[PDB]
Write an enzyme that holds these catalytic residues in place. Structure first.
Site, PDB file in Angstrom:
ATOM      1  N   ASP A  29     -37.238 155.749 144.230  1.00  0.00           N
ATOM      2  CA  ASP A  29     -35.986 155.456 143.540  1.00  0.00           C
ATOM      3  C   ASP A  29     -35.795 153.943 143.454  1.00  0.00           C
ATOM      4  OD1 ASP A  29     -34.160 154.562 145.700  1.00  0.00           O
ATOM      5  OD2 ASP A  29     -34.045 156.649 146.305  1.00  0.00           O
ATOM      6  N   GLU A  34     -37.956 168.401 137.416  1.00  0.00           N
ATOM      7  CA  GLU A  34     -39.202 167.629 137.429  1.00  0.00           C
ATOM      8  C   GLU A  34     -39.252 166.712 138.621  1.00  0.00           C
ATOM      9  OE1 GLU A  34     -38.772 165.666 133.487  1.00  0.00           O
ATOM     10  OE2 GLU A  34     -40.793 166.522 133.189  1.00  0.00           O
ATOM     11  N   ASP A  82     -22.383 157.823 136.523  1.00  0.00           N
ATOM     12  CA  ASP A  82     -22.846 157.330 137.834  1.00  0.00           C
ATOM     13  C   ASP A  82     -24.191 156.625 137.689  1.00  0.00           C
ATOM     14  OD1 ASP A  82     -22.348 156.905 140.565  1.00  0.00           O
ATOM     15  OD2 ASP A  82     -23.327 158.793 141.169  1.00  0.00           O
ATOM     16  N   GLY A  96     -25.915 167.526 147.196  1.00  0.00           N
ATOM     17  CA  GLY A  96     -26.511 168.671 147.914  1.00  0.00           C
ATOM     18  C   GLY A  96     -27.749 168.259 148.700  1.00  0.00           C
ATOM     19  N   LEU A 146     -36.359 165.835 150.651  1.00  0.00           N
ATOM     20  CA  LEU A 146     -36.426 164.482 150.083  1.00  0.00           C
ATOM     21  C   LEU A 146     -35.161 163.677 150.331  1.00  0.00           C
ATOM     22  CD1 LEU A 146     -38.163 165.270 146.659  1.00  0.00           C
ATOM     23  CD2 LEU A 146     -39.217 164.491 148.798  1.00  0.00           C
ATOM     24  N   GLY A 147     -34.015 164.339 150.422  1.00  0.00           N
ATOM     25  CA  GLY A 147     -32.743 163.672 150.640  1.00  0.00           C
ATOM     26  C   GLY A 147     -31.587 164.638 150.518  1.00  0.00           C
ATOM     27  N   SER A 148     -30.450 164.228 151.054  1.00  0.00           N
ATOM     28  CA  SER A 148     -29.237 165.005 150.953  1.00  0.00           C
ATOM     29  C   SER A 148     -28.041 164.085 150.821  1.00  0.00           C
ATOM     30  CB  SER A 148     -29.072 165.933 152.165  1.00  0.00           C
ATOM     31  OG  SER A 148     -28.666 165.243 153.333  1.00  0.00           O
ATOM     32  N   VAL A 172     -32.065 168.126 148.424  1.00  0.00           N
ATOM     33  CA  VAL A 172     -33.191 168.183 147.491  1.00  0.00           C
ATOM     34  C   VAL A 172     -34.497 168.228 148.270  1.00  0.00           C
ATOM     35  CG1 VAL A 172     -34.465 166.977 145.676  1.00  0.00           C
ATOM     36  CG2 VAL A 172     -31.960 166.899 145.714  1.00  0.00           C
ATOM     37  N   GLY A 214     -23.843 163.883 148.558  1.00  0.00           N
ATOM     38  CA  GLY A 214     -22.857 164.530 147.671  1.00  0.00           C
ATOM     39  C   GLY A 214     -23.458 165.477 146.628  1.00  0.00           C
TER      40      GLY A 214
HETATM   41 CL1  LIG Z   1     -38.407 163.076 143.522  1.00  0.00          CL
HETATM   42  C1  LIG Z   1     -36.837 163.652 142.942  1.00  0.00           C
HETATM   43  C2  LIG Z   1     -36.802 164.552 141.733  1.00  0.00           C
HETATM   44  C3  LIG Z   1     -35.662 164.978 141.278  1.00  0.00           C
HETATM   45  C4  LIG Z   1     -34.391 164.549 141.953  1.00  0.00           C
HETATM   46  C5  LIG Z   1     -34.402 163.761 143.007  1.00  0.00           C
HETATM   47  C6  LIG Z   1     -35.742 163.277 143.546  1.00  0.00           C
HETATM   48  N1  LIG Z   1     -33.162 163.406 143.625  1.00  0.00           N
HETATM   49  C7  LIG Z   1     -33.169 162.456 144.732  1.00  0.00           C
HETATM   50  C8  LIG Z   1     -33.346 163.020 146.113  1.00  0.00           C
HETATM   51  C9  LIG Z   1     -32.902 161.919 147.093  1.00  0.00           C
HETATM   52  C10 LIG Z   1     -33.620 160.564 146.950  1.00  0.00           C
HETATM   53  C11 LIG Z   1     -35.154 160.760 147.002  1.00  0.00           C
HETATM   54  C12 LIG Z   1     -35.949 159.477 147.276  1.00  0.00           C
HETATM   55  C13 LIG Z   1     -35.318 158.743 148.477  1.00  0.00           C
HETATM   56  N2  LIG Z   1     -33.892 158.464 148.240  1.00  0.00           N
HETATM   57  C14 LIG Z   1     -33.091 159.669 148.086  1.00  0.00           C
HETATM   58  C15 LIG Z   1     -31.930 163.883 143.070  1.00  0.00           C
HETATM   59  C16 LIG Z   1     -30.572 163.517 143.667  1.00  0.00           C
HETATM   60  C17 LIG Z   1     -29.474 163.992 143.118  1.00  0.00           C
HETATM   61  C18 LIG Z   1     -29.535 164.911 141.901  1.00  0.00           C
HETATM   62  C19 LIG Z   1     -30.698 165.223 141.381  1.00  0.00           C
HETATM   63  C20 LIG Z   1     -31.962 164.666 142.004  1.00  0.00           C
HETATM   64  O1  LIG Z   1     -33.186 165.026 141.426  1.00  0.00           O
END
Ligand SMILES: Clc1ccc2c(c1)N(CCC[C@@H]1CCCNC1)c1ccccc1O2
Length: 271
Positions: free
Chosen positions: A94, A87, A133, A18, A12-14, A20, A16
């Site tokens: 976002d 969850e 943040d 980590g 889903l993304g990376s 996900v 600072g």
């Molecule tokens: Cl769906 C979802 C559940 C729980 C999540 C996170 C996402 N994320 C975000 C993942 C990166 C985003 C996704 C969408 C596009 N832009 C970048 C997260 C990012 C940092 C800490 C905890 C996180 O807990």
């Protein structure tokens, strides 16, 4: 057992925080997010009744009961990383991407969104957690229910009443007292970041980019915004921490009256 208990999906993304990934809990098909952080990149540690990252301590403190925070469901330690199971709303976007796509939000929508963020931040503070943040990228929208959820406690801390002299959050949401003195108190710094967020919502971009603009604290509107909303923003963004409103004062402000409930917000604005 992590590998057998969750089916991993796309990244889903990376950053600072980590990396996900999308995941499914195999037991009951629950959508989850699976977050990996290398041990060497964890500067900030705490303890349970073992040694864990502070992020786990903070998440456990806020994950009891229902709230506008994305909840920690489980965690795992590996030899070189920690893995967090969170969850995952579905469908989800976002707030950064939502605003990037749709531009400045109508005030009715901003009011609903801002209100929910305030409720989530109060919940964290109640639980003894300071997020540090608060920003568009750390807010998820459950597109069907119109419900907002806070993420990323990676820069957070235990809430306290004495001064903080460390900060690893996002600079353009950081208050003038941090820029000038490397000192802030928790609640008043949080209110500043909320002013930045509200501006971001109603204008479609952040008000300050450079340190000098932050310190000057003069807010200009590029978009048509009501007098009442401009007032609340300028109040949150008071240069002196003591001139900023409390959360109670934000939520009793005239602009914050007659908020829509999440479901109505999704029917009008998200469906
Ligand atoms: Cl769906 C979802 C559940 C729980 C999540 C996170 C996402 N994320 C975000 C993942 C990166 C985003 C996704 C969408 C596009 N832009 C970048 C997260 C990012 C940092 C800490 C905890 C996180 O807990």
């Amino acid at each position: 057992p992590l590998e057998s208990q969750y089916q991993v999906g796309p990244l889903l993304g990376s950053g600072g925080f980590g990396s996900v990934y999308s995941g499914i809990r195999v037991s009951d098909n629950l959508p989850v997010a699976i977050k990996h952080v290398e041990k060497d990149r964890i500067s900030d540690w705490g303890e349970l009744p073992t040694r864990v990252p502070m992020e786990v301590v903070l998440l456990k403190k806020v994950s009891s009961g229902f709230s506008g925070v994305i909840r920690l469901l489980d965690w795992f330690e590996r030899p070189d990383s920690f893995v967090l199971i969170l969850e995952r709303p579905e469908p989800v976007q976002d707030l950064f991407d939502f605003i990037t796509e749709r531009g400045a939000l109508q005030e009715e929508l901003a009011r609903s969104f801002f209100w929910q963020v305030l409720e989530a931040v109060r919940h964290c503070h109640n639980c003894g957690v300071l997020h540090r943040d608060i920003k568009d990228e750390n807010i998820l929208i459950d597109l069907n229910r119109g419900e907002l959820k806070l993420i990323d406690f990676g820069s957070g801390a235990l809430l306290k009443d004495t001064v903080y002299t460390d900060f690893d959050g996002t600079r353009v949401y950081s208050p003038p007292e941090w820029i000038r003195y490397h000192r802030y108190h928790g609640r008043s710094a949080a209110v500043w970041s909320l002013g930045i967020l509200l501006y971001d919502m109603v204008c479609g971009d952040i008000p300050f980019e450079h340190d000098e603009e932050i310190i000057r604290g003069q807010v200009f509107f590029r978009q048509r915004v009501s007098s009442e909303c401009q007032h609340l923003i300028r109040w949150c963004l008071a240069l002196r921490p003591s001139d900023r409103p409390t959360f109670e004062e934000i939520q009793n402000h005239p602009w914050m009256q007659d908020v829509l409930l999440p479901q109505e917000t999704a029917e009008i604005h998200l469906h």
